[PDB]
Write a protein that binds this ligand. Structure first.
Ligand code: HEM
Ligand SMILES: [N+]
Length: 151
């Protein structure tokens, strides 16, 4: 469980992210696809993209980037009380998209990388540690629902 001080660090840097949700979303998905190519194969919608240039030029990729960060932001603002927002996400990613928990670890790493690159002043080590804990909490609760369904 995160303390109030840790949640405040997480939400302070997230407020900066909301100033440009589309730019952050695109950077995060591209970072994920370049670092872990097997994740791109899960998206029939984006598997035709081969180079980083093509990825940056895709408006549809940018759109999905917004969807991912808007959903994640709603969860973080609940400060742990995210049952209602996390349940539908877990169901779709386990049974429809078939996304292993390991790929959620990969995207958490991309998020931390991008936040460090765009906000060095508000994302020091203390904030990095808090963000890492918030994403672990996110994964732990997703994994419990995956286990229930048999994934
Ligand atoms: C921070 C993590 C993530 C969040 C918040 C997130 C959020 C979402 C949301 C809101 C949708 C649309 C509604 C739904 O289907 O539930 C979606 C769709 C999808 N997600 Fe995720 N997602 C995340 C991670 C991943 C990862 C790591 C992968 C796989 C490498 C993945 C693959 C998909 C796919 C395949 C779809 C369908 C895209 C389409 O419309 O064709 N997601 N995700
Ligand atoms: N829900």
């Amino acid at each position: 469980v995160l303390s109030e001080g840790e949640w405040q660090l997480v939400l302070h840097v997230w407020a900066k992210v909301e100033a440009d949700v589309a730019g952050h979303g695109q950077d995060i998905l591209i970072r994920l696809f370049k670092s872990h190519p097997e994740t791109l194969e899960k998206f029939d919608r984006f598997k035709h993209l081969k180079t980083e240039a093509e990825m940056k030029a895709s408006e549809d990729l940018k759109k999905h980037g917004v969807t991912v960060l808007t959903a994640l932001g709603a969860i973080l603002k609940k400060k742990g009380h995210h049952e209602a927002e996390l349940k539908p996400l877990a169901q779709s990613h386990a049974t429809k998209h078939k996304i292993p928990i390991k790929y959620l670890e990969f995207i958490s790493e991309a998020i931390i990388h991008v936040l460090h690159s765009r906000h060095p002043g508000d994302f020091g080590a203390d904030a990095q540690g808090a963000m890492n804990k918030a994403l672990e909490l996110f994964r732990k609760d997703i994994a419990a629902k995956y286990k229930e369904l048999g994934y």
